Amino acid sequence: GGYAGAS
Amino acid sequence: GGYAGAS
Amino acid sequence: GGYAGAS
Amino acid sequence: GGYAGAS
Amino acid sequence: GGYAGAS
Amino acid sequence: GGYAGAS
Amino acid sequence: GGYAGAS
Amino acid sequence: GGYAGAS
Amino acid sequence: GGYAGAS
Amino acid sequence: GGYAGAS
Amino acid sequence: GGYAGAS
Amino acid sequence: GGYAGAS
């Protein structure tokens, strides 16, 4: 499983 | 901003 | 399962 | 944000 | 079984 | 089993 | 940030 | 900034 | 089993 | 598993 | 920063 | 700056 975020 | 993920 | 959000 | 999981 | 949520 | 979260 | 894992 | 990862 | 996190 | 971040 | 590991 | 790694 995984994830990615950007702000 | 944004977020995504899965498993 | 998964998800994505953006603001 | 988000969450996912399973078994 | 499993689940996913996003807010 | 597994999981993934992102905030 | 994010987290993922499984067994 | 951003973050990503997986397992 | 394993894991990964990023902040 | 792995990760990458940038600010 | 980030962390990962497994066994 | 940035960081990356894996195992």
Author numbering:
A (entry chain A), B (entry chain B), C (entry chain A), D (entry chain B), E (entry chain A), F (entry chain A), ...: 52 to 58
Provide the publication's sentences verbatim.
KRT8 is known to aggregate pathologically, primarily in the form of MDBs in liver disease. Atomic structures of KRT8 LARKS reveal that pathogenic mutations convert the non-pleated wild-type protein into a pleated conformation, shedding light on the molecular mechanisms underlying aggregation-promoting mutations in low-complexity proteins.
Similarly, the structure of KRT852–58 (GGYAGAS) with the G55A mutation was also determined. High-resolution diffraction data were collected for the wild-type sequence (GGYGGAS) of KRT852–58, but we were unable to determine the structure, presumably owing to its adoption of a highly kinked conformation. Fortunately, a recently determined structure from hnRNPA1 (GGGYGGS) very closely resembles the wild-type KRT852–58 sequence, particularly the residues at and surrounding the mutation site, providing the needed comparison. The KRT852–58-G55A (GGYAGAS) structure forms an anti-parallel class-6 steric zipper, with sheets interacting through the tyrosine and two alanine residues, including the G55A mutant alanine. The glycine at the N terminus assumes a highly extended conformation, like the SGMGGIT structure. But, like the other mutant structure, the backbone at the mutant alanine is pleated. Comparison with GGGYGGS from hnRNPA1, which has the same GGYGG sequence motif as wild-type KRT852–58 (GGYGGAS), reveals that a glycine at that position adopts a highly extended backbone conformation. An overlay of both wild-type–mutant structure pairs highlights that mutations from wild-type glycines facilitate a transition in the backbone from a non-ideal, highly extended conformation to a pleated one. From these fibril structures, we observe that both the G62C and G55A mutations in KRT8 convert a non-pleated beta-sheet into a pleated one, transitioning a LARKS-like conformation into a steric zipper.
